[PDB]
Design a protein around this ligand. Sequence first.
Ligand SMILES: [Mg+2]
Ligand SMILES: [Mg+2]
Lengths: 508, 516
Amino acid sequence: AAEDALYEQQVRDVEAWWATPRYAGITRPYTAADVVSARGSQQQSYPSSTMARKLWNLIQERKAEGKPIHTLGAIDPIQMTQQAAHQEVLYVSGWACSSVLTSTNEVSPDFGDYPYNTVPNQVQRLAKAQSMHDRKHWDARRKMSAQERSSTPYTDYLRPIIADGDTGHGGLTAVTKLAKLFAEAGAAAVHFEDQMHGGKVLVSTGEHINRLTAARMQWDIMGTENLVIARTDSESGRLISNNIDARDHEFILGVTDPSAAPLAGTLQNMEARGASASEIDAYEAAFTRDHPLVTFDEAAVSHMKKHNVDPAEYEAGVAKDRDMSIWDRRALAKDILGADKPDVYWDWDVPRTREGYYHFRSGMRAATKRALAFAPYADLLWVETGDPSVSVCRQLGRAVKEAYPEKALVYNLSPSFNWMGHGFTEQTLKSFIWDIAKEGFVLQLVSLAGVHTNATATCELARAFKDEGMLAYVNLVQRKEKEIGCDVLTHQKWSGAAYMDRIVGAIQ
Amino acid sequence: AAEDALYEQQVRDVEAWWATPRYAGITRPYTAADVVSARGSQQQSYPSSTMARKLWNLIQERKAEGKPIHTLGAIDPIQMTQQAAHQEVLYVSGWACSSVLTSTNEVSPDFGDYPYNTVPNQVQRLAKAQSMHDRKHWDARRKMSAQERSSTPYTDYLRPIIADGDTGHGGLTAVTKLAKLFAEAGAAAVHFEDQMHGGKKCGHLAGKVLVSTGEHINRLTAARMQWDIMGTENLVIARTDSESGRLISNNIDARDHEFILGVTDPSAAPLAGTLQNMEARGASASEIDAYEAAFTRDHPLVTFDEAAVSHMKKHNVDPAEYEAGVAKDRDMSIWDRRALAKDILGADKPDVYWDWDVPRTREGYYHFRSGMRAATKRALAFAPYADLLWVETGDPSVSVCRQLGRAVKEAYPEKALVYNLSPSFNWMGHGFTEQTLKSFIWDIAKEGFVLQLVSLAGVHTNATATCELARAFKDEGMLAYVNLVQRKEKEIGCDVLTHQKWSGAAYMDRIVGAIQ
Ligand SMILES: [Mg+2]
Ligand SMILES: [Mg+2]
């Protein structure tokens, strides 16, 4: 039929699409029929998908060279226009949005607690400005001679946008709607982090995989090729919201002291009888001191050597199966111990927080494992590694390359770190970006760069303008703007006035 | 009746409100009953009104001192926080909104052609950030000792906001809706300018288009009526660009007639109708462009006064009576000027030939003699309807400012003025020294220009800072970031350096800790 042919043609198309090199190694737990059944009859193309292909190709080219795509977080269209000739991509931060532009105009510290259309609205604001300045630029060039065009460098205002998706802002349907808004707004790529929606609390490995799968399916339904970026904060995240996933069990901490009674219960009982907030804090502090936390692997091997049993059989099994459940680990331990010896005591529930969070052994062991777990679901991997170290980066890069030799990584360049005070020289501060790009960190970003440049410039001017008036404005702004050749100096032309003049002249 | 008694009380309360010194010398063409009848049964209070009173009191204090309230246009909450310790008010420009933040996210050159909730939305964004930083600041101060508070200067993040209302974005009902949005969003004052909504003419004779004097007065009155209905004291700022606007959309108002220009050649046929016939005959745009350019050359424009005096001199008639008559009545209508000239010329002389319709533009606009004569006359006409007067005066000039300030103050000695400080003018290449560049703001504050603003300041500082970092970062990476941002930020004591604290992280941590 008319509908049957269109359906069948799209199923064939989607299956072929997923077989292209763009999606080599990417796992999809759903089918092409699943996707086409959700599409309706109306096809639509999105500019973000052309930008996504531009970004994908740029990543492939720079990764092959061992070279960086390093950029600065931009908070407004002015910053976009001034980066366009220099940075090859544009980054949009949710931290920036939280304090400078929210969908409700209610700004706050970054808890990812703005309405979830906030960062997509900032993407749309930048993408529409990109299109305006590309149109102005194309109009300007058509007014030049053909040879003057060859003499003048082309400015590319259509740099692919990378945007912060936070944790996805709720359940899987929220993630699909957030991904939809981003593809509509213009984002070429979106990153999603393995923290709980609402210091840091991780979600299970499987929960985050499901978020990444939800974003991919929505873009598959839309027919767009936007890039999924998976971020993990398990290098520093000490709490996990959910113990259901066996791939996390080796990092969850528990007690070995059988005289420890569940902490959360004690704390609620205390609050019921009227105990002071400090008294609850004091007991919780003492409880952590009195009862040290270890992994079950650690408790088992300690129990075996204590009872004169070789742990090698256990250690081989957990090494062979990193993701062995706690249930199967206890089974393996008791067989090795046998009937005569007592069983390992270990309880991860007893020390849970008031919220019910479990304790988690953060570090690069957990972060590397999660990066590998996320790799078949993501186009780029973003691992927070702590303070900048070429050494740590090299280790992570090789660990990922040996399992997924084509996966590119992202690095978050800290704006606040004391580089010189922590071992760097001017030479090694300069080469850092290029040093880690050789190890596979292709996309690199100073998240809050546009916040800090803007704050510093206004701070300097505001103080001086109070006492020196227009002398301060000319010295600190007008003179400098002219010296460096900033094209906003002629603001009317910069804004596109000549472009609109021609259109109005054509209409009349 | 009980209800009727209440109504009369509210009417009496409005009348008493309008009799306070805040509204001395302000003309309202409506009654208190008019206002109360539009109010409904619930009145609510608006923070913008508290900010408006704060701004009014600051203007009164600074004007008495001959001192400036000089500020910088801010485009985001970051710039607001860095200005709060230094600039006593905050300015929000519509030019900046047009290129950086529109209610539809469609940025473009400034034609005042974004949807009219655009600048109110930017005001709301800044006002909500002011409240957030005030709450952060207050919370931090309650953590200090009582003595440490006495020793630490209090930062006032609640600076009154002045915002661009463009032309009012349409007819009188749009002006009232826009005024309402600004009062809801948090603006202490709004300025409205006497240009035609729909933007400037483009191409030949490109430039601003003025409305009639009376049209702009009705806009000022509409905004005041809306704020009266709301019970708010926001400040009306009247802006005129008749120092440079060479076209006017409407000739109905006799107060504009002395500036409107016309032809004296009886052989000139109407230009717009000729161009329309040519366009209808297949003539190209260039051939039409040619006829218009030639028409402008062959038929100079003059005011009716100049035509009548030149005509009297040609026919050996003393023009002294005509000149004395129109000097006495600057507002004489063209109808009455023609009759005066005709009576002086007498039955045995031909009458003055002068036609202000023949040279009209294709849109139907009239030609207008721009300059400080028109600008000063309009400033005086708007004065009874405005809390502050904003007169564009051209190149920065203490002399021109002093003349304008004196001219206003001889009729309205209490009236405060606004000065728009150009960020683009080449001060040092046009007669300023470093010393008089510095003193300019204080020099004109002594002449009554109490409120002064660099409207695009936050556009230019932001662009310059990113331009410099973006170039260097491409090649020097984190070395450029440390050299140009991090090190400088710490060396000048910018409090965004510690962005977590700056954003309010400790404030929210205490709220969450108090909830659990
Ligand atoms: Mg975020
Ligand atoms: Mg405007």
